[PDB]
């Protein structure tokens with residue numbers, strides 16, 4: 723069943739209408755997260771290799787959960803009459819990046835560099851697996867505090883990666899690009915890069931740059947904290963108004979500000995210990 727294979731603990735997270743529980747796999751006492759998804763809340767369905775009807779979130783998790791990566795892996799899933807239950811890896815101790823920034827404030831650039839680099843590697847992994855996350859933000863990034871490793875979570879707004887235009891979007895609006903706000907259309911990669919620019923600004927300034935649609939479409943970036951010129955340049959490049967003017971993942975990682983990144987363990991010893 724499910725209640726027999728796992729020892730269910732308390733609900734995780736604060737606020738929201740989701741239902742993710744802390745759990746432990748009885749067989750080996752492995753820490754897990756038990757995520758419940760309401761069928762009536764599912765708008766995008768897909769089919770696994772076998773051809774079964776499941777939430778797109780499951781399809782995408784399966785595609786990226788092969789091997790090691792900076793993405794939280796799906797260990798198993800169950801279908802119930804009115805919902806699906808996903809068993810996910812659970813780092814311990816852990817803290818999501820949103821809470822981390824709330825407590826620490828704007829992050830030192832060395833730390834932001836390490837974190838951003840890991841997010842880039844995780845997103846590249848997703849794209850390599852043919853998956854577009856569509857909801858990259860601090861709330862969807864978990865920090866494995868002891869290892870200094872970041873993990874991407876929640877593919878509930880994702881889609882299969884494609885080269886044609888997307889005209890649907892259910893991610894976080896303040897991280898969405900101007901082309902979506904104005905024309906209700908975008909391409910996967912350039913929209914992802916825009917969200918990464920928002921995330922990087924969030925890390926080095928302690929809050930997102932835009933709150934209203936008018937600010938997003940104007941694209942003017944004001945830095946509220948002291949940020950190096952190189953970092954500002956990278957952020958402004960990711961936030962270019964024209965999609966084709968934004969950097970590719972390769973250009974981001976070859977940017978001067980991204981050089982000499984700390985290793986995950988070094989990051990934990992210096993900034994998380």
Ligand SMILES: Nc1ncnc2c1ncn2[C@@H]1O[C@H](COP(=O)(O)OP(=O)(O)NP(=O)(O)O)[C@@H](O)[C@H]1O
Nearest residue numbers: 734735738739740742755794810811812813875876
């Ligand atoms: N693998 C995990 N390990 C530890 N905590 C997790 C894990 N997955 C999810 N959580 C917690 O559950 C919360 C929401 O996860 P999420 O995948 O966004 O579920 P959700 O259905 O989209 N609920 P919400 O985002 O609040 O509307 C996060 O804020 C975490 O604190």
Ligand SMILES: [Mg+2]
Nearest residue numbers: 740862876878
């Ligand atoms: Mg969520």
